[PDB]
Amino acid sequence: SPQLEELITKVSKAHQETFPSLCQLGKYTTNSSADHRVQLDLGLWDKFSELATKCIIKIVEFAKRLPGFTGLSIADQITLLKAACLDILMLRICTRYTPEQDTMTFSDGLTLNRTQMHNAGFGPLTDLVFAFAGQLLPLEMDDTETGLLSAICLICGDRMDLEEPEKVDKLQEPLLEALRLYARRRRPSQPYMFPRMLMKITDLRGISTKGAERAITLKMEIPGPMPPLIREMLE
Ligand SMILES: CCCCCCCCCCCCO[C@H]1O[C@H](CO)[C@@H](O[C@H]2O[C@H](CO)[C@@H](O)[C@H](O)[C@H]2O)[C@H](O)[C@H]1O
Numbered sequence: 723s724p725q726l727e728e729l730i731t732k733v734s735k736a737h738q739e740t741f742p743s744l745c746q747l748g749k750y751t752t753n754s755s756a757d758h759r760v761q762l763d764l765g766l767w768d769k770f771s772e773l774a775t776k777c778i779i780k781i782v783e784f785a786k787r788l789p790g791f792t793g794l795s796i797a798d799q800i801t802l803l804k805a806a807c808l809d810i811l812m813l814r815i816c817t818r819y820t821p822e823q824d825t826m827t828f829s830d831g832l833t834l835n836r837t838q839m840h841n842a843g844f845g846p847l848t849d850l851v852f853a854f855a856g857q858l859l860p861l862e863m864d865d866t867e868t869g870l871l872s873a874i875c876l877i878c879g880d881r882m883d884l885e886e887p888e889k890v891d892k893l894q895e896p897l898l899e900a901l902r903l904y905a906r907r908r909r910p911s912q913p914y915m916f917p918r919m920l921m922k923i924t925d926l927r928g929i930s931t932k933g934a935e936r937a938i939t940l941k942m943e944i945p946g947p948m949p950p951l952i953r954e955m956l957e
């Protein structure tokens with residue numbers, strides 16, 4: 723119980739210090755390809771891919787702040803990050819959804835409308851990602867819950883090629899305990915919030931599967947290779 727409370731605060735702070743909240747960021751816009759969908763706008767892809775690389779690095783930084791993660795083998799650390807990074811990217815961008823304006827906001831404040839998200843690279847995946855974001859809103863998750871859910875997504879023992887899956891399982895246990903404790907304490911009249919949050923992990927895995935399929939077609943549309951940390955994530 724004191725150790726669990728410290729875990730909650732450590733994970734929450736790790737998330738916040740690697741992921742500014744929508745409220746914190748000074749939004750700015752772009753007028754590129756803003757009113758009609760096109761196969762790909764290469765100026766938007768260049769900016770989007772740069773922001774994706776930066777957030778991958780931030781997710782690695784987050785991961786290394788999770789209690790016990792750096793006690794896993796370096797191979798297992800890398801396997802877990804490769805398996806979960808796109809899931810966590812998807813959760814992160816969808817927490818930055820502003821429904822009144824139909825926009826998502828990146829960590830430098832760049833705020834793209836739905837058509838621009840399409841044109842930056844999401845392409846035919848755009849509306850499914852926005853629908854996931856829309857169905858995240860009624861859970862009204864806070865930053866602590868987003869951070870814990872992210873940690874649960876990452877630290878999971880089912881990933882292929884783990885050396886020490888039991889060790890990974892044991893690290894996940896307190897994160898699950900922490901999320902349930904926190905969520906019920908914050909909103910005791912809404913006891914389905916914890917199971918709803920865990921079911922979002924399945925949704926995220928589905929959308930990340932679709933994102934990996936989109937990466938294959940996108941590669942045929944861009945003038946060079948994808949950035950190297952994106953390629954690490956996709957392998
Ligand atoms: C999921 C696919 C990835 C698989 C795992 C492999 C990725 C490994 C990433 C390690 C990143 C290297 O980290 C090293 O270089 C980064 C880039 O110059 C630095 O990153 C630093 O600057 C970045 C801006 O560029 C900031 O967002 C980081 O917060 C800051 O720490 C690190 O402080 C340094 O520790």
Ligand SMILES: CC1(C)CCC(C)(C)c2cc(/C(=N/O)c3ccc4cc(C(=O)O)ccc4c3)ccc21
Pocket residue numbers: 770771773774777811812813814815827828829830843844847932933934936937940948952956
């Ligand atoms: C593999 C590749 C390149 C191509 C396929 C698609 C388009 C599905 C894709 C999507 C993402 C992505 N999906 O949400 C994402 C991107 C930037 C993000 C930036 C931030 C941020 O600044 O705080 C937060 C979340 C982000 C989340 C990343 C890579 C890719």
